[PDB]
Amino acid sequence: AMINLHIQKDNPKIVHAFDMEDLGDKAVYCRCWRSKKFPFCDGAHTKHNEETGDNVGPLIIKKK
Amino acid sequence: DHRNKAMINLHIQKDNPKIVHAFDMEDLGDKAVYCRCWRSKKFPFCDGAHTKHNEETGDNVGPLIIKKK
Ligand code: FES
Ligand code: FES
Numbered sequence A: 001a002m003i004n005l006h007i008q009k010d011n012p013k014i015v016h017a018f019d020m021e022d023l024g025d026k027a028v029y030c031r032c033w034r035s036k037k038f039p040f041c042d043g044a045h046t047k048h049n050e051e052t053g054d055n056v057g058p059l060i061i062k063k064k
Numbered sequence B: 001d002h003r004n005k006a007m008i009n010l011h012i013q014k015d016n017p018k019i020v021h022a023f024d025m026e027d028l029g030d031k032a033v034y035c036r037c038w039r040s041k042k043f044p045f046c047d048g049a050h051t052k053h054n055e056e057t058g059d060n061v062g063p064l065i066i067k068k069k
Helices: A044-052 B049-057
Strands: A014-019 A026-029 A056-062 B019-024 B031-034 B061-067
Touching: A044 A056, B049 B061
Parallel strands: A014 B061, A056 B019
Antiparallel strands: A026 A056, B031 B061
């Protein structure tokens, strides 16, 4: 059972790296691999959780 | 039976109906490496578990890194 079904399948291992300096106020990152704006969350987790009974959700990196 | 759709997170914090983590950058140090495969024993941090997931399932998931320029 794969987790990522369709994103960047020509990449054998998808890793993203960002510098905190470039982030601004808040960045919300997808952990469900269903976002159409991956690596950013676009709310797709909700339908994923609904269909599957799962409980996954995003990672938020923000300024204090 | 394709009516039963596979979960992404199999085991982590199942008493939590939707797992979200929120961190302030100032608290992150030089680098933080976050799990996006839900198999790490150190979740929400990556501990290398994605490698075994990828070999077993044919997937290509990997972590998210936040660091200083
Ligand atoms: S769209 Fe994937 S965690 Fe929100
Ligand atoms: S252990 Fe999950 S992405 Fe590395």
